[PDB]
Structure 1
């Protein structure tokens, strides 16, 4: 009765999620976490690093909902 609470070793697991993020055109902060087996707290952090990379573009900014689509996803 569970998913994958945290346990985000940043090796191949972390590389698979951002490649999955390279596969999905648009991403939702709660949605990715259950889209790819992980908790919500992990979901915002990698995307923020993608925002630091400039590979993530935000459209709505709120404490409840933050949405990201890859700047280079059109490739």
Structure 2
């Protein structure tokens, strides 16, 4: 219902949580963690900047992201 737009110390916990996945959409993070999609969007822009993820499809509405190896 209510989400944090704004992760603080838990941004690394989120990074570990998103790295703890097989694939994800920024909307899937919004369901899995109580985060606005916009926060999740920005967070995953640098998740592929850290290079631990990859785009499968990119569309304006939705982009599917599969973590490169992360195994």
TM-score, normalised with respect to structure 1: 0.79
1:56 corresponds to 2:53: yes
8 Å CA contact 2:2–2:34 kept in 1: the answer is no
Structure 1 59/10 Cα, relative in aligned 2: closer, same or farther at 3 Å?
same
Larger Rg: 1
Stretches (4+) displaced over 4 A: none
1:22 corresponds to 2:19: yes
Hey, what's the Cα distance between the residues in 2 that align with 1:43 and 1:36? 9
Shift in Å at residue 30 of structure 1? 0.7
Give the superposed CA RMSD: 1.7
The alignment covers a number of residue pairs equal to: 71
Please list every run of 5 or more consecutive structure 1 residues that lacks an aligned counterpart in the other structure: none
Structure with bigger strand share is 1
Find the counterpart in structure 1 of residue 4 from structure 2.
4
8 Å CA contact 2:19–2:52 kept in 1: the answer is no
Shift in Å at residue 68 of structure 1? 1.0
The one-character-per-residue Cα deviations of 1:12-43 (angstroms, maximum 9, x if unpaired) are: 21001110012111111211112111100011
Please list every run of 5 or more consecutive structure 2 residues that lacks an aligned counterpart in the other structure: none
Shift in Å at residue 2 of structure 1? 2.4
TM-score, normalised with respect to structure 2: 0.83
